[PDB]
Structure formats: C-alpha cells, structure tokens
Scaffold this active site. Structure first.
Site, PDB file in Angstrom:
ATOM      1  N   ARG A   1       0.276   3.145  -5.902  1.00 46.84           N
ATOM      2  CA  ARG A   1       1.411   2.234  -5.777  1.00 46.84           C
ATOM      3  C   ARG A   1       1.319   1.368  -4.526  1.00 46.84           C
ATOM      4  O   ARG A   1       2.317   0.798  -4.086  1.00 46.84           O
ATOM      5  CB  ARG A   1       2.736   3.005  -5.811  1.00 46.84           C
ATOM      6  CG  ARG A   1       2.991   3.664  -7.174  1.00 46.84           C
ATOM      7  CD  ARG A   1       4.137   4.684  -7.120  1.00 46.84           C
ATOM      8  NE  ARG A   1       4.408   5.267  -8.435  1.00 46.84           N
ATOM      9  CZ  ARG A   1       5.289   4.798  -9.312  1.00 46.84           C
ATOM     10  NH1 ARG A   1       6.074   3.772  -9.029  1.00 46.84           N
ATOM     11  NH2 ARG A   1       5.382   5.372 -10.509  1.00 46.84           N
TER      12      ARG A   1
ATOM     13  N   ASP B   1      17.995  -6.776  15.413  1.00 47.11           N
ATOM     14  CA  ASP B   1      19.158  -7.630  15.244  1.00 47.11           C
ATOM     15  C   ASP B   1      20.395  -6.894  15.734  1.00 47.11           C
ATOM     16  O   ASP B   1      20.545  -5.696  15.484  1.00 47.11           O
ATOM     17  CB  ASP B   1      19.350  -8.017  13.776  1.00 47.11           C
ATOM     18  CG  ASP B   1      18.248  -8.917  13.255  1.00 47.11           C
ATOM     19  OD1 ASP B   1      18.335 -10.147  13.455  1.00 47.11           O
ATOM     20  OD2 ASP B   1      17.291  -8.390  12.649  1.00 47.11           O
TER      21      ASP B   1
END
Lengths: 236, 236, 236, 236, 236, 236
Positions: C44, C205
C-alpha cells in the site's frame, strides 16, 4: 468565610498541598511530618494544616471520598487559595497481574466512569493527566530513597461497591495499576487553573486475587509513599 | 471493622437513620434532638450517633459531599447495618421562579448528571425516586406543624462549581425545586435493598435571583426541617 | 505475507520503531539518519525501513492518516513483529495561548473524539497515555540538545476538516498543547500488548492566532524533533 | 382546526382529562361512567369526550401507543386546551417478585429507554415524575374503596416486542412495579406547562413468571382502576 | 500544493472518481483500464490518476485506510477539485448467511462504530446513504454484464482487529452484507457538498464461516467489480 | 386474537401492505382504490383492509403516530401475518432547499433521534435502510406514470413539537428530503424478518421557508403518491 467549605483565609495554604481522603490521615501527616504546623481548616471536619517540611512551606488537607468531594476542595484551593501544586496521596486497589499489595503507584493519568470530564470537553474523551514535573519529581524521589515504584494509569470510579461484570478484566488487560475514586477529578481542575497535580497511592488490595495488606504492611507502604511525596515537594 | 468506613457494630444503628452531609451538623442534631445518644462511628471524621426521639430508636450520621460519598455510607447502612429507612436532610439551592429562600422542599425524585444510575439500568433512564410512605410522612408532619412545604423534583449534580450554560434555565423550565448533590445516589440504593429513602431540604439560595438566607434565617429553617423529619420518623 | 498490510518477514523490524504519517517522510528519515538501512515494507505504499542509528537497531515506517490506520499498523508491529517501543513523530496544530509555531511538543496523554477507547473499556473514559520512560527519554534528549520543549496533552481527532464550534476554545481552556490525528489510537494498543509508546510533534500552525510556520521554519523544526527522537531511542 | 390532531375547540375539554391508549376504551369510559357526554374529537379516530362525573366536569380521550403519540396529544391538551390535570389509565406488565397479576399500580415516577427526556435536560437524567397531589388522590381514593395498591416506579419502553437480555432482571432488582409505554413521556410535558399528571395501571402479565390475567380478570381489574381514577378526580 | 495532501491542480480531476484503499491498486486500475492516463498526485504515496474510459473523463485515486483518511481525500475532491461523483471500489468481508466469498456487493447505506456522523447531526442517527442514481447505475451495469450482485447495507468499522463480542451475530441478524472501513465516512461528505457517492465491494472473506477467496478468485472478482463500476460511470 | 393489537386472522393480510399513520386515510385508500375490499381489523380503531388492486391482493392499514406504534403493527404483520412487503405511504415536511411542497419523496434511508436502532446494534450506528427492490419499484412506477420524484433521506423524530435549535439547519445542510415520525422504526424490523419495506411521502410543509400545501395541492400530491405505490405493488 473565604469559601463555603473552608475557613482558611487566603494565604493560609502553601503553594503545595498534599491531600488524602481521610482528614484524620491528613492530621497524622501534619503531626508526624510537618514542623511549625498550624490547623487552617476544620469545616465539615475536613482538617487542613500548614507547616514546613525540611524548611519549605507545605500544607496537607483531607478531600473526602469521590470526584465531587475532591472537586469542591481542589477548585477552591486553586481558585481562592492560589495553590500551585496538589499531590494526592492515597490508597488503592489493583487489578494488574504484576502489581502487588504493598506496592507504591505513581499515576500518570486516570480513567473514570464519571461524566465530569466529558462535560468539560464537549462530550469527548478528555484524559485526566498528571503534570509531568510532578510525576518526574515523584519518580526521582522514589529512586533516591531506594523505593521501587509502579508508574502508570489509574481508574477513578464513582462506585466503591461495584457490581459491574467485566470491568476488572478490562482494566487488567490494559494494565491499569491503581483503582481509586478521586484522581480523575483532580487533574482537569489543575489544568483549568494552569496549575499542577499528581497522585501517588499504596496498594491495599488486589481486587482479582483478593490478597490484602496487613496493618503492618499498610504502615510500611504508607511510610514509603509519604516520604516520596514529601521529598518530591522540595523539588517542586 | 464492620466496614472499611464505619467502626459501628451490627445493631449499633437504628432502623431509621437521618443523614446530612456535614458530620458536625449530624453531631448538632444528635446533641439537640436525640435522647441518650451514643457516638457509634468516627472513622474519617464521619460522625454517627444512635439514641431515641420520643421513645423511638433513631440514628443520625454524616454522609459527606457528593453521590460517591453517600453511596458508600448508605450502601453500608442498608447492607451491613440492616437499616430500613434513611431520610436525607440538607440545604439546597433553587431555580424555580415560585420557590423562595427559607422554603422547605420535600423531594419526590431527583435528576442528575452522574452516570451511576445509567450503570444500574443497562444505560437507560432510571428515576431516582423517593419512597412514597416517606414522602407522605414528611408532608403530613409539616402539615401538623403548620410549616408550608414545596413538594417536587430535585437535581443532584456532581459539580458544585458549575460552568454549564443553560442548565439553570432548563431546570427552571421543568420546575425542579431543589438543587443539591446527593439524593439521586441514595434512592436507587434503597431500591436495591428493598428499603426506603427520602430527602427534605431547605432553600438557602435562589440561583436565578440571588436572594440568600441570612444566618438567622438559615438556623430557623433548619430547625423547621429537622422537626419535620423527626416527627416523620414516628410514622415510619 | 505475515500480515495483510505488511510484507516484512518476522524479525525484520527492530524492537524500537519511529513512525510518521507520511511514508515518503519515513523514507527521508531512513535515508538521512539510518545506516545499514533496508526497505522492509512496500504494501500500500506504506514504506518501512530497518537499519541502525549510532550502532543500535532502529526502524522507521509510515502509519497513514487517522486512528484506524495507525491502529492497523501498530497492532501488527506489537503482535506479529514483536516490537517493544513505538515513538510517533509528526506535526501538529496548537490552540494553547502559551504554545507557538515551531515549538516541540512531547505528548503525555491524548484525548479524542474517536470511539475506539470507549469500546475497549466498557464505554468509560480510558486515557490514551504515553509510557513514562518514553516521555522521559524524549524530555532528557531535548535537554541534552538544548532544544526547548512543551510537555502535555494532545487531542487526536477523526476529522481534519473540523466544523465543530467551541472545540478550540475548550481545548485551549484545559491547555491541550497539540492537535493531531493518531496518538490516542496508538497508546492503548501498546497497553494491550504490555509494550511502550510515545509521541513527539512540532507545531506548524496556531489554530487560534492563525500564525503559521514557513517552510524554512518547518524544516528546522523537523530536524530538531527527529534528532530528539533518535537520541531518545539510544536510552530506550 | 385548533391543532393538527384534534378538531375540538378551546373550552371543549374539561380541566381534568383521563387518557388511555385505546380510543375505543375512551368511548367505553365515556359511555359507562360519564354523565351528559359529548364527543369532542374524532381526528385519526382518537376519540375524545367531555361530560361530568358526579356532576364535576371531566373529559376522557385516547392517546395512542407510545411516547411520541402521547406527547402529541398531551402537549396539545395542556397548551391549546388549557387542561390542568391528566391522569393516564391503562394496563401494564410487571417484573417485581412481589407484584401480581390484577394488582393496581400507582406510578410515582417512570424510567425509559427513550431519548425524549435527555433532550429536554441537556443530555442529563430527568426523572419523569408524577405530581404528588395526583399520586396522593389516587392512593386515598383506593383506600376509600378498600382496593389494595402498589405505589412505585414504572418503566416506559418504546419497544413492546423486547429482545433485550438482562432488562427484566435489572428492573426487578430495583423494584420497578410496572412496565408500559407512555408515562415517561407524559410527566415532563406536564412539568413544562406547570400542570399536573399521574398514572394508574393494572397488571395484566407477569413478565418473569408468565402468569397472565384471564379476559374476565382484566375486566374486573379495569373496573377497579377506573373507579379509583374517577373518584380521585373529585379530590383534584 | 493545492491541499496539504494533494499536489493536483484544480481541474486535474475528472468529475467522476473511482477510489480504493490501496494506492497501488489505484495505479493498476489506471494502467489497465484508463486511456491516456496521467498521474496527477503522489503526495504521501496516495497515487491519483486522470484519463478516459470509453471516451468519458475519469479519475482513480487511493484514499488510504479508515474513515479519517477517506474523509480528508474525499472532502478535498468534492470541495477543491469540484468532483461530482465518487464510487468507492474495494474488498469487504461478510457475515450474512446467504452471502459468499466472490459475491459482488452494491452498498445502499452503511452503519458504523465511528462518531463522525453523530457529530454532524447533533448527536442523532445520521444514515450514511449512497446516492440512488449511483446504486442504480451499478446494479444495471452488473445486469448488463450478467454478473449477479448483492444490494444492501454495509458496516464501516474503525477497528480492523476487532475484539467485540456479539457484533458479527447482530450484523448477521439484520442482514448486513459487507464489512469494511470507509464507506460510512464517504456518503455524508457527498451529502454536504450536494454531490454523489456509492460503493461496490467484492467479498474476500466470510467472517463467520471462514471461507476465503483464492488468488484466482480475487482476480476475477476484482475484474468483475471494476468492469461494473467503469460501465456505471458511463451512465453517470 | 392473533395478536393483542389486531383481530385479523392469519391469512387476512396480503403479502404486501400499504400503511399510513391515520386509519381514516387507510379507509379512504381502501374505499377509493381497492376492489373487493373487506375490513380485517378494527382493534384500537386502527382500521385495516384487504382487497385487490388490478387483480392482485393488497392490504392497507393505519399504523398510528411514532416509531413505537408502527413497530408494534409492523412486527406483528411480518411475524404473525407473514407479510413480505410493507410500504409506508405518508406525509412529511421538508428542509431541503430544492424540495418543495406538493413534491413526492421516495425514501432510501431514514435517520432518527430514537434509541431503538442503537439498541439493535450494540449501541452503534444502524442505518434504517429501505429495501432496494422496493425503492426501485417506486422510482420506476413514478417514471412509468410521468410523475417526478425526489429520492433520498428521511429523518424520523419522536417529538412532533420540536424545541431543538440547530436541527433543521443540519438536516438541510446534509439534504434530508423528508421529516416524519415513523420510517426509521420500520426498516430494521423488515431486516430482522428477512422481509422488505419502503416509504413514500408527500411534502405538505417546508419547515424552513414555512410554505404549506393548499388543499388542492395536497389532493394532487396524494393522488400521485398513492398511484405510484399501487402500481409498484404490481411489480413486487
């Protein structure tokens, strides 16, 4: 009075406070470990004291049984009395297969079956989490005193007389080391006030094996726990 | 010891017990209203007493603050001490626009923000409900004393220092008459043991309009409530 | 294959694994910091690698985005590959008024809006709690490196694109230092297997003030975090 | 029409209304016990009637099955039609070991597996509580008729055909005396409008022992219950 | 980058997107079924591609494992990239007695143990529901290809490695046909943006009987499912 | 009687039943659209009828108001009367910005504020989902009749007189097309019995704009809905 539950005036409590559920044990701690000790509260029989330990001001006070009781006393201590650090000093059960009666448990966080922390965080999971400086001070004090410790999660229940099938086995599976009734209520209040809290407990009972500490073992573990807590305050 | 929290022996409590949160108030009731009272518990300072009132055995004991605390003490009284009837006596706030300070409130059922009753009834709504004979005995005793009463719902919170917006308005909309911290924990325990419980409280504060009962007025309504409860025990 | 999501043969992971959400960032960590490094998984695209850092075996592997993803990979690492320690390394936002962009956050516990931990503990509050030795190693590594750190609670959300009003204010009120998406899922799995986990994040942030770290600041931040983590592995 | 579910005009209902689930039973009550009865509603076949009992104004109306149905009709009665007292009359099951088929149950409060009362009280436990004057009037009426009664808690379920393991045992443990489907939805609406409500039911089935009342016994039980209710209206 | 997780520019994605959990499986679909295919994203290894199928523009992209992962990628696709239709293509397990490995399942709605949909609808039940036009397009394409299908409910779980007792039995009793981890997160996002979503999965495993698909059967199942989905895009 | 709520004998109900809340509307449907009609139930005034539509046996019956009421009647129809398909034919409000009064809505799934479906699936999200053959028969019948339809989600509430802020705006945000009170309880019962259910509703009111269908519009929409449902029975 400065609060409905405490006759102490602002300034009567030290910036650090040890708390235990039994006000008579708060008195024992003051009588046997504090110098210059003064009683500063007796409302509802919830004895509180302020003195010094190795020269440093320190208070000790009962908090009664259960999250709602400690929440009243700790909210007041942080908000009105401007306390900076509370360390709960208690006794606990364990379910952990590798924790034993007599062991000292230093609590990093506490789960609960109470709704009080969901109500603080919009219904979500709010981990009641001890302050890292407090945990470290307890861990380091125990090491310096040559006392082994278990460090990890507690579980604070509203119901001493539990009737809940499956609970003990689930707490054991995830290696909760201590079962008691208060610490999950303390830590979020410390957070709200930008202050510090921790918890250290002695194991009185193994809830799964049913082994129980003799009175002499309870004396030994108390002596260990309280010396760890007291020495930790000197570093906080 | 007979329990972890009570040094009394089986038989030391009467079949009827009045309980209040403050153990010093339990001593006041014993000293001022009980004949031939003996102290039967002082563990954790939670004073309990057994005597008679107008010939009939009666006990009075503190229960501490909050549902977890009263659950320990009341579970023990019903299970170990074979108590049949507990009447809680306390103070409360009110939000109801037609209830005023100094009013006497007789509790029929109690809401809560605690999880303890959902845990008893597979997560469903379980009404903490007073026994009807106890409710009626209190109502009729107040009638006999010509003391007006309010009869209706209480709300038992885990959090004395509420930060919950909109709670008081919802409680007033549905005419909750008493706000306190313990009755919702007591009534289901009585149910479990096939026993009886009730609660009677005096209003010391209006939470919405901020009226507050003077020291003199609080003593007067305490004397009213306690006489109501004491006379009620003669019918139970 | 030894599991449905990992092509590594048993024993190909070291006992200590660093994990980050981005598999390309796990490659960048193996390339720049591991020696003797070999790719051990590609299923994956979730690249994983195993080599050494300063002589000691270490692995690094992506874990994808969100609690269900890290739960798959962590469960397998602890169960099938016998890993003992996982340290999550990543980025986060903050709401705390005293935390700023570029800060390094060491996670002691993580709240969440996921249901996975309630499902482990009979519907109750289960604090996702970091292992203390791991927390301590990270704190001590940063100290040795003279890198300031914040130590405290994270909040792990299922929803990156939040629409929830009031969440940020409540997180800030209780001094959550880090908002991310995985750590609350990792710690209980480590508990189940009796193993160790931790998490260290850099603030990209400020969710409240809207301050935001430049790419130059973001590389400087990542470089500090990863050095702290790698040096901590030497003491674990 | 005055409401979407009721063609009656304001004034067409008396201040006291008996309600039962089956509109055909409401007609039976109007035909056999009311004087000078007039039909005042037939929308959706939910027959309602107004007449007098012993000369006192009284109405009787169906409420349909379950909390949502009774909520519609009760809300309208209190709000639009200015009704002051509703007494629900019906049949119930029981789980209590000492309550028997044909027993008359007077409901003090009702639990539920509905969400409607959590939604009224910010997600908390709101006990659906009968008005004390209504309870007492029912209790006293039965005494004057020499009909024994059980006074206690009901449980209102949304699911007649229950598949829930453990529910009956927990209802029996806590001495719930009646299982039905509506009363928990009625009592909070009465509260909202500052009005009165109560409930009286006869036991048709023992849920746990499986005893069942014969058709003849059900008629006899109904006759006892409706006379208790009608006579209680004379005292209210 | 256009988003923190996608470097594609606006307009780089077709209006119709097939998505699967494994990015390498997405690359396979693009290579083997899309004409004139270009990679439009590879951030975090989450490969996405845009080409045409039988003339119509069509994209295919990985979405990772679990609701939080697909929520990020689908929210961006609908919002930033202005996509109109997402069809999830995947594998699933089944518990239904009349569903067998190799069956093709078209999902009409999906249950879940995630909290994400309660948080969108004030804590209530929000059915994650596939768009009817998409469901109908899939069913009719399978008919046109003479491939039998199963049409019904899925269940999206957060925990691949389930420890939950009773879950499979309840899913079977209510005829859930597919168990996977993403679709219940997708459908409500499509709703928010006024857009369309569906899901189709092939059964790889019978959770209850423990039958499992062989290498050959996985191949012909995936070929059957992808052809169904691709032909369906022609009618959408 | 065959059930406590229905005097029909087994066999009296056809394998397909149309149901609406108002028994008087059930009678109108039988009188105006069924041939060879006979009344088969009158218990509680919940009129039910069996006849033929275009030669095929069909039944029609009221279900009362609310999930508890339809649950009783539908459980009995599937379990006792061996009914194979139930189509609810009802009226609704809408919140969707692109849905208008007079519109016909075919329901693919229904959310709810009831607990009944959490109780069926271990407290998780259980989408109340319409059977795909029923949905498709309704859609295709409307197409054959040149009647436009809306296809999508309903919301089934327990509380007609809603006081809940923010609910309508959330339902509109996620494009719920129908608000009513019953469909969410019907579909899971069909699932339990291996049977089929659907729902079609006419929009009488826009909850947000407050538009309301005139009498003439309600007749037009009713005639449209009922012809759709009747024609769909021929294909089921």
């Amino acid at each position: 009075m400065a609060t409905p539950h405490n006759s102490a005036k602002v300034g009567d409590f030290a910036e650090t406070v040890l708390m235990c559920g039994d006000p008579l044990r708060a008195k024992l701690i003051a009588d046997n470990y504090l110098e210059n000790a003064k009683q500063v509260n007796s409302v509802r029989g919830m004895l509180g004291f302020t003195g010094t330990y190795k020269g440093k001001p320190l208070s000790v006070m009962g908090h009664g049984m259960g999250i709602p009781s400690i929440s009243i006393y700790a909210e007041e201590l942080y908000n009105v009395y401007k306390v900076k650090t509370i360390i709960r000093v208690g006794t606990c059960g364990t379910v952990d297969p590798n924790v034993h009666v007599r062991d000292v448990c230093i609590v990093t966080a506490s789960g609960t079956d109470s709704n009080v922390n969901r109500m603080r965080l919009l219904g979500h999971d709010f981990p009641a989490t001890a302050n890292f400086e407090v945990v470290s001070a307890l861990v380091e004090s125990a090491k310096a005193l040559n006392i082994p410790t278990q460090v990890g999660k507690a579980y604070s229940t509203d119901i001493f007389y539990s009737k809940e099938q499956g609970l003990n086995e689930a707490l054991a599976q995830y290696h909760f080391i201590a079962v008691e009734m208060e610490s999950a209520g303390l830590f979020p209040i410390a957070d709200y006030y930008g202050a510090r809290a921790g918890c250290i407990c002695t194991v009185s009972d193994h809830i799964i094996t049913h082994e129980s500490a003799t009175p002499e073992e309870r004396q030994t573990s108390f002596q260990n726990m309280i010396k760890i807590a007291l020495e930790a305050t000197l570093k906080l």
